[PDB]
A paper describes a structure:
Hepatocyte nuclear factor 1A ([name]) and [name]-4A are transcription factors that engage in crossregulatory gene transcription networks to maintain glucose-stimulated insulin secretion in pancreatic β cells. Variants in the [name] and [name] genes are associated with maturity-onset diabetes of the young ([name]). [name] and [name]-4A form a crossregulatory loop, in which both factors regulate the respective other’s gene transcription. [name] binds to the P2-[name] promoter and activates P2-driven gene transcription.
Numbering used by the authors:
A (entry chain A): 85 to 181, 200 to 276
B (entry chain B): 92 to 179, 201 to 276
The structure:
DNA sequence: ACTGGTTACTCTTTAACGTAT
DNA sequence: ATACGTTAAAGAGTAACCAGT
């Protein structure tokens, strides 16, 4: 199939390895801040990095959040995962047109909190409207069309997830 | 042990189960913090879920009376053992009183000599015994929370690293 | 739908250990 | 000696699910 012919060419694969090599020459903290920002932008859990590369969860967490040091070879696996994952989510959205758990994005949480101030038990028509509003905002923060919301995958907002967020919030008001 | 003592234990569980659960939760959580008893110790001995217990102790998350009865039963029995342990598996836990002594000591010097570290061992062990209302002569009752010289060293080591 | 009770999952923190200057 | 490197353990926060209305 012509669409599956979008494997990696040798020249483009070498460019990936070159990026990883140039990343290892940069300051490790500055790259850690950029990888962490990417994980938050597309709500990619740190466990997916752990299960793929084999890095320790605490060492990865402390390296991304605090700047805890990490040897070159381990950082090379992190950067190799980063460059590979970027292309993977890139093709995931253009084709939209150990399963990870849904995570509420910060952009959607503001939309929900503002709806919570005006109604704590939203009807079905209010919940479904919030679904389209949240998935649009999540698509925007990723530099993606809202028409490609199917690419959100495990982080796609459903009507059921909106009800659970409101119900759990009412629980927190105690 | 004694029948009058065994009946007393069942009695206090009855009263505690007939009180506002949040009040007893703070009382149990304060006892855990006072003696630095890990919540994992409770989970292993009671069979309560780690998230449910932490949320019940911290936030007042609901918990059935049957589950609460297990937490209360563990609580009364632990107090008798802890008292016996001081009259005569768990990882070390720094107490809040000891940490203030170490903060001040760190403020003066960051790579303490084996002299100053052993002095701080005594100050922290005396400070931890005061927090639980025992005499400093019963510091061996601290068990897994007894302050040693290596533990003071790793505290200053890890804290120097946290400044970088 | 809803509250009440409940938890697997996820991640941060803690204390401790080993290794290379 | 001591900074650098590393992680098992511990616990808090999150999303979700069920039971009985």
């Amino acid at each position: 199939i012509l669409k599956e012919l979008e494997n990696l060419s040798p020249e483009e694969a070498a460019h990936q390895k070159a990026v990883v090599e140039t990343l290892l020459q940069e300051d490790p903290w500055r790259v850690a801040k950029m990888v962490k920002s990417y994980l938050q932008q597309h709500n990619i859990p740190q466990r997916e990095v752990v299960d793929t590369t084999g890095l320790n969860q605490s060492h990865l967490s402390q390296h991304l959040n605090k700047g805890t040091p990490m040897k070159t070879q381990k950082r090379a696996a992190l950067y190799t995962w980063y460059v590979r994952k970027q292309r993977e989510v890139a093709q995931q959205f253009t084709h939209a047109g150990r399963r990870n758990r849904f995570k509420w994005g910060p952009a959607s949480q503001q939309i929900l909190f503002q709806a919570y101030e005006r109604q704590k038990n939203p009807s079905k028509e209010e919940r479904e409207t919030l679904v389209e509003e949240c998935n649009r905002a999540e698509c925007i923060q990723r530099g993606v069309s809202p028409s490609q919301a199917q690419g959100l995958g495990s982080n796609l907002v459903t009507e059921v997830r909106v009800y659970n967020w409101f119900a759990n919030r009412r629980k927190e008001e105690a």
